[PDB]
């Protein structure tokens, strides 16, 4: 009202400068950005082979959450704790005279790529998580087939870092359980079954399915309307 | 021109030291008239829509 006035701006070509708008769709990103987006895109447009496209099929958030819950109970020794343990046998064992066994038997998760593999190969692993990042994918592509062959139940998981955190590394590439306290066996055999249902079991079937061949949605629609009109007149 | 009282570089009118006054005359006239016609352009085709 007052001595105020409505003057609504016309923005329709020919007149009044455009306003500031959001141009995030339109920005000249740094090349390393372009390269990493184009990379992912290129990887979906090609026809990816089945012994690669079997990854991408990751564990689901529910099941996994249960797996990281269980594995957390078994983290490997800490900085402090080991120093703390070592003096509970440097002192204790050497004098009171134990068999280097005034320490209890360790129950921790197994990790390190070359470590986990001999384990699998020796049928000693009992549940293995393979990462899904892993850039030299080769480091890990054989792991599904191995486990399958060794009849060791396995699951591809999201987070080379989430594997990393649970073992005090930045990244880990693989986590494994061999041992397990009896009071936990229950929870694990449970996990093994769900996991095996989605991986080891479906494996032979995954083996025939080439991934990718996915259009961008400019062209995905361009034929979703072309195939729509041509047929059904 | 930077060593000179500001009056030497201007005349006392709209668009003073910058356009020739018969130019100012012109762009006032055209301003008024075109701003006016804008009114005659709007309400006229405001009738078009209502009588169509």
């Amino acid at each position: 009202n007052p001595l105020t006035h409505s003057t609504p701006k016309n923005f329709g070509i020919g007149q009044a400068v455009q306003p500031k708008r959001n141009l995030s769709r339109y920005v000249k990103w740094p090349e390393y950005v372009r390269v990493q987006r184009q990379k992912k895109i290129l990887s979906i447009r090609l026809k990816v082979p089945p012994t690669i496209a079997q990854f991408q099929y990751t564990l689901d958030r529910n099941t996994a959450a249960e797996t990281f819950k269980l594995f957390n109970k078994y983290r490997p020794e800490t900085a402090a704790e080991k120093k703390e343990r070592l003096t509970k046998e440097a002192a204790a064992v050497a004098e009171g005279k134990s068999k280097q066994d005034a320490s209890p038997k360790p129950y921790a998760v197994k990790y390190g790529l070359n470590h986990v593999v001999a384990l699998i190969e020796n049928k000693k692993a009992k549940l293995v998580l393979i990462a899904n990042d892993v850039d030299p994918i080769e480091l890990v592509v054989f792991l599904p087939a191995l486990c399958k062959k060794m009849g060791v139940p396995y699951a591809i998981v999201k987070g080379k870092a989430r594997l990393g955190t649970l073992v005090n590394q930045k990244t880990s590439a693989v986590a494994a359980l061999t041992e397990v306290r009896a009071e936990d066996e229950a929870a694990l055999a449970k996990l093994v079954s769900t996991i095996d249902a989605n991986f080891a079991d479906k494996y032979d079937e995954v083996k025939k399915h080439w991934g990718g061949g996915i259009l961008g949605n400019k062209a995905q629609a361009k034929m979703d309307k072309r195939a729509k009109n041509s047929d059904s007149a | 021109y930077a060593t000179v009282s500001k009056t030497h570089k201007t005349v006392s009118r709209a668009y003073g030291g910058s356009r020739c006054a018969n130019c100012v005359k012109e762009r006032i006239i055209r301003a008024f008239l075109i701003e006016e016609q804008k009114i005659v352009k709007k309400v006229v085709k405001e009738q078009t829509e209502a009588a169509k």
């Binding site: 500031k20 708008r21 959001n22 141009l23 995030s24 339109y26 920005v27 000249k28 990103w29 | -």
Partner: protein
Amino acid sequence: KALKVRTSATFRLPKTLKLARAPKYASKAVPHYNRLDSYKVIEQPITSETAMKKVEDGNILVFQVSMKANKYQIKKAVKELYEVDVLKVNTLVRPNGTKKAYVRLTADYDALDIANRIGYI
């Protein structure tokens, strides 16, 4: 949740923290002593016959002076080495690559006095 809003289509180098030098050891152990003290600035008086004539008549002192020294440095040092005040310093590089300062005292000081105080005549 959701993304950034950029109104500009151009990207630029994120203005990042420019940390300052905190050397773990030192540049040169000992800083150099002043490379041009008054004494190095003004070298000898000039006492050509024609030089002198500027001291009787002109109230001007003539100094072969450092090539490395400018009109300021010459003034400050004639000032401080001799108690006097300077109106103006003119300078000129000799045809033998030594520099000459026509130093002109202010009207309070009788140069000729001032000349055979330093002891030339």
